[PDB]
Design a protein around this ligand. Structure first.
Ligand SMILES: O=C1N[C@@H](c2c(F)cccc2Cl)Nc2ccccc21
Length: 284
């Protein structure tokens, strides 16, 4: 069923809450035993948001290999994403260790450091060229190379140096700065513009490690970003683009990380973004 018609049918009936609860009811449930070990309590921002054991990212160290991060592998679309929480004061070094070890080229940030008057994630990147950051626990150095501030997002070049080997790599940080404190954007135009800027950069492409995506918990806005990208790629690839079922793609992604898409308004926004983005993907 063409999703645009399914959309108007749910909207006229006002059943968004009922569709969303059906997804929550059918979603996968797998064990998260490593996340719940007592040694890991200060590595988790939220007690109710954990990575599944089968899909968690492992840090390459013998001490403690744990980070709140999951590998989402979309077999038919041929895309991989790492979804993670906003780093904590004691996990900023783990975060950049993961970026290094997984060979990522991009970090996608969908939140502000402060929202609703509270801290949603650590200030984990340098704000001035001449004041670099050193992470002594993981032996990494991070330098701001340049910034490009626009109305809806900012792009920057970070130089990450492995202090052990003196190798360096250029990481691109894509920061969406205008998602509202409450609800979802009224139009998906600026969110789709942002997604096409990440794509055009090569960060989502198979010659690199998976893109690292985060918000505060790494499930809501983060969920929206990877669902919209995967749905538009499947509409490009298949003979019948109207076969793409957004609810079935979301349940496949929820086999790899719990809770992706946190509200009925985020589900509706995801439909809107895919419907509007398809009017480029189908030749315009
Ligand atoms: O939009 C982009 N801007 C640049 C950029 C910066 F990130 C920071 C400062 C100046 C510039 Cl010029 N970097 C990019 C890399 C790949 C794709 C897109 C972009």
């Amino acid at each position: 069923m063409e999703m645009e018609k399914e959309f108007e049918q749910i909207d006229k009936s006002g059943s968004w809450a009922a569709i969303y609860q059906d997804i929550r009811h059918e979603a996968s449930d797998f064990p998260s035993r490593v996340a719940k070990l007592p040694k890991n309590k200060n590595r988790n921002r939220y007690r109710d948001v954990s990575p599944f054991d089968h899909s968690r990212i492992k840090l390459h160290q013998e001490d403690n290999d744990y980070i709140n991060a999951s590998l989402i592998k979309m077999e038919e679309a041929q895309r991989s994403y790492i979804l993670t929480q906003g780093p904590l004061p004691n996990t900023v070094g783990h975060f950049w260790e993961m970026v290094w070890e997984q060979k990522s080229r991009g970090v996608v940030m969908l939140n502000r450091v402060m929202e609703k008057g509270s801290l949603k994630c650590a200030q984990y990147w340098p704000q001035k060229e001449e004041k670099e950051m050193i992470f002594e626990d993981t032996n990494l150095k991070l330098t701001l190379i340049s910034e490009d501030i626009k109305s809806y997002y900012t792009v920057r070049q970070l130089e990450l140096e492995n202090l052990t080997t003196q190798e360096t790599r250029e990481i691109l940080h894509f920061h969406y700065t205008t998602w509202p404190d409450f609800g979802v954007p009224e139009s998906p135009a600026s969110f789709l513009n942002f997604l096409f800027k990440v794509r055009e950069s090569g960060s989502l492409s198979p010659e690199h490690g998976p893109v690292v995506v985060h918000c505060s918990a790494g499930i809501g806005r983060s969920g929206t970003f990877c669902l919209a990208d995967t749905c538009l790629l499947l509409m490009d690839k298949r003979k019948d683009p109207s076969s793409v079922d957004i609810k079935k793609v979301l349940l496949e992604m929820r086999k790899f990380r719990m809770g992706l898409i946190q509200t009925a308004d985020q589900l509706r926004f995801s439909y809107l973004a895919v419907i509007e983005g398809a009017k480029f993907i189908m030749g315009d």
